[PDB]
């Protein structure tokens, strides 16, 4: 048993008296400071830590963890009773006028309190949240599958009577409630006045509300099982912390959903459950001098996938893909090869390095396609758009394996992306436009066997030229025997299996975070071409077109491609004007990509 009044007094004592020596030994009363802020309305949410509560009463922490909703109410009541001690927009105006009438505690309450969970509690998986943990504070990890828009949830409804000019209040707890109709005040009832109640949305307390669904991490599920899911209901300042696809740990109260009416007799003693979220947590000039070393271009190209030898100019092209040209701007590239040629490994490296990216197969996936898809979620039945590799990759790069094996719907979708960088999709017969400006990194196979150079690329790869010409660079990752390189590759693979790590390579790859910083500040530079370099572009382009005509996949898009690549290298040099080396690099990269194809 418990004496909850004494518990409230002990909670008041903790809030008044706790200090933690923050800001390097200033002996701050942290909860007193936050109480001052709440009283002044400069702060709305108060995340009390049960690790702090443990430092003077472990029994109180146990009582909170075992009966969390009760103690949430007790902590809130204690804080509200203590705000005047530390009291040195529209609802504020209404509370002022109601104080004038005095001259509904839940309405006058304009703060919220949450328990930041204790570190002694291990963070569970969703599957480990047993029925014994109902009504108890639990910490749960998972992927955020889906999040609803923030909606207003009525906490305390406020009505006004037409006949007697009196306000009436209706606190709300259940997910459904009966709105009041006829006036209950005695001056209406005794006079039989027939006065009725009008809801005042202006003078009634709402709260931000958001419904999301967590899901098990795939590598923690048992072997033969579907991943489990849990509905998480989020209120107040906890809203908008999460996004779909994010990894989170949620401290909250595991509770049952108490439905009304016909569902009660149908379900019987069983009940659905939700997690009442209390806390959601989410799982350089020396370096610029290193960048300043003029090796940096080749240093980065070496840092790109030391697991793959050779193809260094392809690595340079991939670097320029991540950099992008002047804003168009995406350096789409394609690299064909046989199966197993290390082509997939290279694409996997770009997907891992890039800050925003996706990796998928052109074929036929049972997942969400390259375009987004509309899920149903039939417990609610509300259809919602989700995913899409191109959409998830929007600001970055989308990697497609076996691009040749795409369906015609996928080919038309990529064609639309190449044209205008947006796609069309239907939710419920109606349709919208959905945005995707990702660069495409395409890997494709020969239609049959190992590539034969005697056959042209479109006839061999079996892709339409309308798509295949979109890519700025076309590379052929051909594989043939070579004794010493095969032995080096084998030694690398065997060391990887033997030690689970790449062997030393007689150099140090740059940190991927530092590479990301570098390409970010690089992408923030905005080059422009001068007229002399435009003339140089003209001369180089016409000579290259002579070579292509004498050996035809060269057009105005070729001039635009070399301009894009030269501006990309100008970004790489981190200078706001292009130079002869940029055009030379673009010309040789295109030429030697054709040579690789030849």
């Amino acid at each position: 048993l418990k004496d909850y009044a004494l518990e409230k007094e002990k909670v008041k004592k903790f809030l008044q008296e706790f200090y933690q020596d923050d800001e390097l030994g200033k002996k701050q009363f942290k909860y007193g400071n936050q109480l001052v802020r709440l009283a002044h309305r400069e702060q709305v949410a108060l995340y009390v830590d049960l690790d702090d509560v443990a430092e003077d009463d472990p029994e109180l922490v146990d009582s909170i963890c075992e009966n969390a909703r009760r103690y949430a109410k007790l902590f809130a009541d204690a804080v509200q009773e203590l705000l005047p001690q530390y009291k040195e927009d529209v609802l504020d105006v209404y509370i002022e006028h109601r104080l004038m009438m005095e001259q509904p505690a839940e309405l006058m309450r304009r703060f919220e309190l949450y328990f930041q969970g204790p570190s002694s509690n291990k963070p569970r998986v969703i599957r480990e949240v047993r029925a014994d943990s109902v009504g108890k504070l639990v910490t749960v990890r998972g992927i955020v599958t889906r999040v609803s828009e923030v909606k207003p949830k009525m906490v305390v409804a406020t009505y006004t009577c037409d006949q007697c000019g009196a306000e009436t209040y209706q606190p709300i707890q259940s997910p459904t409630f009966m709105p009041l109709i006829m006036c209950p005040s005695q001056e209406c009832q005794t006079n039989r006045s027939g006065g009725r109640l009008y809801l005042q949305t202006r003078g009634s307390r709402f709260i931000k509300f958001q419904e999301m669904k967590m899901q098990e991490h795939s590598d923690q599920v048992p072997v033969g099982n579907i991943p489990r899911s849990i509905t998480v209901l989020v209120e107040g300042e906890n809203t908008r912390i999460a996004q779909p696809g994010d990894h989170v740990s949620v401290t909250g109260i595991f509770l049952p959903i108490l439905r009304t009416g016909f569902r009660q007799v149908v379900q019987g003693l069983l009940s659905e459950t939700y997690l009442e979220a209390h806390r959601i947590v989410k799982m350089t000039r020396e370096e610029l001098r290193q960048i300043a070393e003029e090796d940096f271009y080749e240093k980065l190209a070496a840092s790109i996938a030391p697991e793959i030898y050779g193809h260094e100019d392809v690595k340079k092209a991939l670097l320029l893909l991540l950099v992008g040209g002047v804003d168009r701007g995406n350096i789409n590239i394609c690299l064909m090869g046989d199966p197993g040629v290390a082509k997939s490994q290279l694409l996997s490296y770009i997907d891992r390095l890039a800050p925003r990216s996706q990796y998928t197969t052109g074929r036929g996936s049972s997942g969400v396609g390259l375009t987004a898809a509309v899920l149903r979620d039939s417990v609610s039945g509300e259809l919602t758009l989700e995913g899409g590799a191109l959409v998830l990759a929007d600001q970055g790069v989308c990697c497609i394996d076996e691009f040749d094996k795409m369906a015609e719907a996928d080919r038309t979708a990529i064609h639309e992306v190449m044209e205008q960088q947006t796609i069309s999709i239907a939710k419920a017969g109606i349709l919208t436009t959905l945005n995707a400006r990702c660069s495409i990194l395409a890997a494709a196979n020969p239609a049959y066997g190992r590539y034969n150079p005697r056959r042209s690329l479109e006839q061999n790869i079996q892709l339409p030229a309308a798509l295949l010409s979109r890519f700025d660079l076309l590379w052929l990752i051909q594989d043939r025997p070579d004794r010493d390189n095969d032995l080096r590759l084998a030694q690398h693979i065997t060391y990887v299996h033997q030690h689970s790590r790449q062997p030393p390579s007689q150099f140090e790859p740059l940190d991927m975070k530092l590479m990301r910083r570098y390409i970010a500040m690089c992408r923030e530079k905005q080059p422009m071409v001068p007229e002399s370099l435009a003339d140089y572009i003209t001369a180089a382009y016409v000579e290259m077109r002579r070579e292509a005509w004498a050996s035809t996949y060269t057009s105005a898009r070729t001039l635009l491609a070399i301009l894009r690549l030269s501006t990309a290298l100008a970004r790489l040099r981190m200078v706001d004007v292009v130079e002869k080396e940029d055009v030379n690099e673009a010309i040789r990269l295109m030429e030697m990509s054709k040579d690789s194809l030849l």
């Binding site: 006949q163 009832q189 005794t190 006079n191 039989r192 006045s193 027939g194 006065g195």
Partner: protein, 87 residues
């Protein structure tokens, strides 16, 4: 239970009734000659408000039809001749 108001002479001699009607026009003002329509509108507005406060259940015209009959009763009549002049 069954606490239904009635509007009989006890209601009319309550505080909200004739004792209130003796005083409701203390705040009022009238324009007089040539503006009798506006003065009538103010007059009916004030006494309609008084009727509503006294017995909200009825419309004003129905309230008048009730009260014009109900004034004949002896209790409200004695209270009337008290209100007239003074106690």
């Amino acid at each position: 239970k069954r606490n239904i108001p009635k509007l009989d002479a006890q209601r009319l001699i309550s505080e909200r009734g004739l004792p209130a009607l003796r005083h409701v026009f203390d705040k009022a003002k009238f324009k007089g000659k040539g503006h009798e329509a506006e003065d009538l509108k103010m007059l009916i507005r004030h006494m309609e408000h008084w009727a509503h406060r006294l017995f909200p259940k009825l419309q004003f015209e129905d309230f008048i039809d009730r009260v014009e009959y109900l004034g004949s009763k002896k209790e409200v009549q004695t209270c009337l001749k008290r209100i007239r002049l003074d106690l």
